[PDB]
A paper describes a structure:
To extend the structural coverage of proteins of unknown function, we targeted Pfam protein family PF06684 (domain of unknown function 1185; DUF1185) and determined the crystal structures of two representative members. Despite lacking any recognizable sequence similarity to other protein families, both proteins show significant structural similarity to proteins with a Bacillus chorismate mutase-like (BCM-like) fold characterized by a β-α-β-α-β-β core that includes a mixed β-sheet (order 1423) with the β4 strand antiparallel to the rest. The biological unit of both proteins is a hexamer and analysis of homologs indicates that the oligomer interface residues are highly conserved. Structural similarities to BCM and genome-context analysis suggest a function in amino-acid synthesis.
The SPO0826 gene of the marine α-proteobacterium Silicibacter pomeroyi encodes a protein with a molecular weight of 20.5 kDa (residues 1–­193) and a calculated isoelectric point of 6.2. The crystal structure of SPO0826 was determined to 2.1 Å resolution using the MAD method. The final model included one protomer (147 of 194 residues) and 42 water molecules in the asymmetric unit. No electron density was observed for residues from the expression and purification tag, SeMet1–Thr2, Gly103–Ala115, Lys137–His145 or Gly172–Arg193. SPO0826 also forms a single domain composed of seven β-strands (β1–β7; residues 4–17, 20–36, 78–85, 119–123, 130–134, 147–151 and 161–170), but with only two α-helices (H1 and H3; residues 48–69 and 91–97) and one 310-helix (H2; residues 73–75). The dis­ordered residues in the SPO0826 structure correspond to a large C-­terminal region of BB2672 that encompasses helix H4 (residues 97–109), most of the H4–β4 loop (residues 110–115), the β5–β6 loop (residues 137–145), including the 310-helix H5, and the C-terminal region (residues 172–193) after β7, including 310-helix H6. However, this interface was not observed in the SPO0826 structure, which crystallized with a single molecule in the asymmetric unit. In BB2672, the N-terminal interface is involved in the formation of the hexamer, while in SPO0826, it is only involved in crystal contacts. The observation that SPO0826 crystallizes as a monomer in high salt and acidic pH (2 M NaCl pH 6.5), while demonstrating the same hexameric oligomerization state in solution as BB2672 under alkaline and low-salt conditions (150 mM NaCl pH 8.0), lends further support to the hypothesis that pH or salt concentration might be a key factor in oligomerization.
Numbering used by the authors: 3 to 102, 116 to 136, 146 to 171
Amino acid sequence: KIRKIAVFIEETRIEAGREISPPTRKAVAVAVIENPFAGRYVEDLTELMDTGAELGALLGERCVQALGIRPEQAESYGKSAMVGENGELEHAAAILHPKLLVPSSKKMGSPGQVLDVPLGHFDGIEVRLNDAPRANEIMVAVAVTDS
């Protein structure tokens, strides 16, 4: 149930007043999905763990494709999830449970709020989408840095 996928890349060529050559780069891939447990009180979150496994792989691959690198060339990784208002924080936990240690963060939010994705070699990258996550959604992110 993926409504939107978004990929953000950032290249830094000058930092602390110093020319960074080659530029250092960060990428983050984000998916907006329907939370099957929105509006509900459930204990068995298997369905979100299985969905998270596939998303991590999908978003991790989008990151490396965006940076045009092989996965072994990545310096840092991280992942986060923001649950919409009719979900629970445990839903974000579940979605982040499977392995892609890699830092992760979970938050509750609303459309347009910024999610900070940690980067463990914490540093980080901010992501947002103007219209996500809606109350019945989850916004999941995977980030990778290069160089």
